[PDB]
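Final report, results section. Input specification for complex C-07:
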Amino acid sequence: MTTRMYVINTLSNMHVGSGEVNYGVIANLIQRDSVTNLPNINSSGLKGAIREYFKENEDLVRELFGSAPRDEKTLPGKVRFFEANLLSMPVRSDKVPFLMAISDEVLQELITKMKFFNCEEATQYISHLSTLLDNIKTQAQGTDFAYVFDPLLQGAIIEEVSIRATCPSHIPLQPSLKKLLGDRLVILSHKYFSILSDDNHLPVLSRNNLENGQSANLWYEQVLPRYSRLYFMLMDGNAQSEYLKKFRDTLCTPSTIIQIGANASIGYGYCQISELSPF
Amino acid sequence: MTTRMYVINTLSNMHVGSGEVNYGVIANLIQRDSVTNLPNINSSGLKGAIREYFKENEDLVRELFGSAPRDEKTLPGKVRFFEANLLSMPVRSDKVPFLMAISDEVLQELITKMKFFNCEEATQYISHLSTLLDNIKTQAQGTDFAYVFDPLLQGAIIEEVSIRATCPSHIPLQPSLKKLLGDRLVILSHKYFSILSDDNHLPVLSRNNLENGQSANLWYEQVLPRYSRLYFMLMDGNAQSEYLKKFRDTLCTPSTIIQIGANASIGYGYCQISELSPF
Amino acid sequence: MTTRMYVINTLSNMHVGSGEVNYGVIANLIQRDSVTNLPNINSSGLKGAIREYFKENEDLVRELFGSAPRDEKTLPGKVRFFEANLLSMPVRSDKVPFLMAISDEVLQELITKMKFFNCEEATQYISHLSTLLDNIKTQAQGTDFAYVFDPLLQGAIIEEVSIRATCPSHIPLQPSLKKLLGDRLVILSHKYFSILSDDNHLPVLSRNNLENGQSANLWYEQVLPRYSRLYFMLMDGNAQSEYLKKFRDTLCTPSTIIQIGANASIGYGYCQISELSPF
Amino acid sequence: MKISKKQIEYAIEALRANNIITNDNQYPKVFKGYISSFGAAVIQSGLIPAIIFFENEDNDANADRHKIIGVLKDIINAMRQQYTVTDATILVSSQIPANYSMAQYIIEHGNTDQLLKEITEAAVAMKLALRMYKSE
Amino acid sequence: MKISKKQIEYAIEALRANNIITNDNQYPKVFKGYISSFGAAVIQSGLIPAIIFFENEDNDANADRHKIIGVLKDIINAMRQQYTVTDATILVSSQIPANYSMAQYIIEHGNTDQLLKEITEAAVAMKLALRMYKSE
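Structure output:
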């Protein structure tokens, strides 16, 4: 009722514009965290996307997100959105189409942020995540690692950095951890995860503008690969129970799709928000 | 009603450039999926091609695709165009001129996309596709497989991957699945399809430029084989029903051919668009 | 007035060389279609040859084919050239010098192409070609076949002792179909036609290079046999009626011979282009 | 047409087995011309004429010219050894008897396209494998 | 396939080492075509046939075409060095012996996926590095 974790689970390729000056080839770049240089979505972007989804519900938007711009009533929003951090990203493999890549440092940051925010039903999650991390560190013994949790997925190749994923047959992965971190999950060092999510490895697309067969303009766009998983913390202030319940149920309904990103008409940034479950 | 699946049946060899400097043999490469690395059409290219077809109907393109690049007023597009992912590809055979190749992972991705987006006729297609996939997994028992559903196609060879397709008599292929996935359909493992769809097995064509009979340049182009099939989602916003109905009628008319990609003057990328038929 | 089918009647041997390093017997192979593996002329080569023929008329070439490679402005091509797929191939016999060989799958591809592209005179051709196809399939009942439409050509050896011709006295071959497909027409099973049209059975020509009467090099060249028939589709864009009429009149006159492919100086690839006659 | 590394391995083994590549990894220079001529004869005249020409042992040629036909049979046998049960129903997976005449084997088995494809594969493999070695 | 500067330096050193670049910074003009055609031969014929064709020393070529295979081996060996050795790494950082020919090494060591990638990148580096010199 105070702090709930939400997972984004993008269905398409996301482009959230950083709006910063460019030194390089890609004219349009995606947002990244200043400290970790990991892809992220600003709280303003999340609030805007969810507000646009709920725009037809005037009362719900007014109660949760607040007054519209250039409206004279000046109503603050009862809901505080926190920055969305990249949890899991798809990674090209050979045994399977892609792999769910979660780095040990992102797991540590998730545990730290769960402890800091005291997320709802996060005690068991923190305990089990810490057991997973401790077992991973025990197996790794300070060396770089790539750990899968399916016996079928052992020996998978991460193409970009050329590392083989081994299966630690002594570490358990609880079902709720599969539901959170993703299916076909590989755990690797942050050294490899940084390479897998830098500006040279995540997709770059060329885009054109044609005028009776004449190319008027040329530029390049970079996007976040689809099926990527991002987590953000929602602080539900002491608000109306009915509007909070309606908003939570609509967000968690599998029929909902939220567009966070730029290129809406060409299907960029459509996502499915899910809140943390028990365990 | 919002989300419908459209199948792209290419009538020619398609080339959708990626704008990537290869520095190797194949200077001109085709676009590939961000996560699955399968050949695809970016939704920007799809939108541009379909807009170019409908450029005569200025009202329709203004209402659906939006305002022209040079326009004092800006009008966001109402229709959402999703990227066209490869569904089935023609593979060289011996008994028949070619087979329609699909991988079990492509089928899983199709089922997942229909579940997430809830296409118009999603329920029956998901049910029958899941039954087909479960039967395939039961028959294969974790091995490499190649299954054809006509008894006359038993032992048909795939030229690029020197394997012969078996006939599992227990698995039925429903006629609507035949209409969706293509006639003379072969289902094989992800390894086989990945080898069939990599850069070394896709059709690469040599081209040159002659100046008074002397060769001036020389480059290699790769193309997506003719009669390939691709699927993409179309989500309508608050689009007017009249223009939407005209759009669907003109798009799915058998007389309608759309050019997507490059090399238009040499007949590259001419396609037909059809909706998801009721099951 | 938009889409037209043209038949290429080659007055000599044709070598449209593919960019291919074959380390076997044939050093220089011809281009084969990316799907059916049948000999074909790439649309780029056909467009280049036809543009070379019309190079004297600067206005016609500029309006129909586009601008020259070395030009400050580039003009998109207006007329669309589709690749020339094989229709009829002469096959050596014992009763007759050569018969025109077509396959049931080639006929199916022709019917499908005519249906999809909507040629000018496509309706009657589609109807009669279809009826012929069902008659042939009804007679064959799955087994391999070689069907001639002259009772005199019975028992003819179609280039191989295994392939013997029989006359089914229930299938009428209409005069217009005879004009389109060839005078002495034999329709073969796909197995037979692929055996006759593969790299081990296509005509090969031996060439050597002499230095002061002594041989320096020696290589083998694959050629498409003389009087072969290939069909390609021409799409009129938004081109002017006058230039289009001049182009069609010049292309379809009996005194027009166009050079397509390689070895122009030694007589390879001189062709006559004929428009689809009304049925 | 793309020659597999397995085919090249079979060609190397067969060339060593039918005493063509010496123990010093060298071969008589005339065998390269022999293999090129066999390929040309196969494509021009046919399988039966070329195999009959190169199966002869009363030929007064400068070397044992039947050795390439022996190597051909060895390569085809090795190819047919690795046939799958799916292939065995369509293709003739039987091992060609050693003493059996290759031309007689082709003739008694018709003139099927399978034998022609196997012969062409093995000829190109022989060409490449010979190119891998030195010609003293 | 972005330009890898380290592979370019490897290509420079290997081109100088296998007597392609003369003391005056010039090379036989035909080597340009050799490097350009090797990549196409690898892509559309197979890695083993292309290597065998370019490794042959009994060729009627205007220059020593087999020098490019030695340069390729030198670049590949330099890349095997400076490989981050760890338990998870797929890449085999084992150097190709000088006595073994390149065709044999890929034949005996049947993991072509690494070799194919290394050979393609080394050929691209070759072609890009040959442009620093005069095309005599």
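The helical segments of chain B are 43-53, 58-64, 104-117, 122-140, 175-181, 190-196, 241-252. The longest strand of chain B covers residues 84-92. This concludes the modelling results for the funded period.
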